[PDB]
Design a protein around this ligand. Structure first.
Ligand SMILES: NC(=O)c1ccc[n+]([C@@H]2O[C@H](COP(=O)([O-])OP(=O)(O)OC[C@H]3O[C@@H](n4cnc5c(N)ncnc54)[C@H](OP(=O)(O)O)[C@@H]3O)[C@@H](O)[C@H]2O)c1
Ligand SMILES: CCc1nc(N)nc(N)c1OCCCOc1ccccc1CCC(=O)O
Length: 159
């Protein structure tokens, strides 16, 4: 399983609002860092500009049509087909455009379900558990810093 989706979405599959995350969940950032460190993130241009700096200790690949894009510490690709040449474990990082382009191609999905309803303008595509086996489902821990219930799902495409 070398090609995966990595996403956090709420009960209505909202993933973003005005180029930011609608929630603050440190546990989920830790989850991303644990899964992706030492591997490769592929993300759309808008998601990269939301993040600003590339994330440390992993390969950052940005998909953009902009031939002027040349950011220190960032690798640039210009086509969806470029993804299939990246070595190692590749995580599709978002945003909405990337997720829709890749949900039918990935081997598996690491989904953080945020158990709330936020205002969004960007969405993860609908998906059915008739196509996806639950490899694991783990409730996130609530504390002073993580106040929204959340569940970590690992889904694997059924054969
Ligand atoms: N909750 C999560 O898991 C999560 C994850 C990621 C992002 N987000 C949120 O989602 C929103 C951003 O998503 P978005 O869909 O608006 O933007 P995006 O997918 O991050 O970026 C869209 C851009 O990516 C480039 N791109 C996409 N497909 C391409 C293709 N086939 N060929 C070439 N370039 C391509 C284009 O850049 P150019 O216009 O430069 O060509 C396009 O404008 C924000 O709110 C962000 O916070 C949330
Ligand atoms: C941490 C959110 C997140 N969580 C999971 N499980 N998968 C993602 N693909 C994901 O999105 C990562 C890409 C977009 O992330 C952002 C979008 C807007 C602002 C900030 C960030 C991440 C950096 C941060 O939150 O400090």
């Amino acid at each position: 399983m070398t090609l995966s989706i990595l996403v956090a979405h709420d009960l209505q599959r909202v993933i973003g609002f005005e180029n930011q995350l609608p929630w603050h969940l440190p546990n989920d950032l830790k989850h991303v860092k644990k899964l992706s460190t030492g591997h490769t993130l592929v993300m759309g241009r808008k998601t990269f500009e939301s993040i600003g700096k590339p994330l440390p200790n992993r390969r950052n690949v940005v998909l953009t049509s902009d031939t002027s894009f040349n950011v220190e510490g960032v690798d640039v690709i210009h086509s969806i087909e470029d993804i299939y040449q990246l070595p190692g474990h590749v995580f599709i990082f978002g945003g909405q455009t990337l997720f829709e382009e890749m949900i039918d191609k990935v081997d598996d999905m690491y989904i953080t379900v945020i158990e709330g309803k936020f205002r969004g303008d960007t969405f993860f595509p609908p998906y059915t558990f008739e196509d996806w086996e639950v490899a694991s489902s783990v409730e996130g821990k609530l504390d002073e810093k993580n106040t929204i219930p959340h569940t970590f799902l690992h889904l694997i495409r059924k054969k």
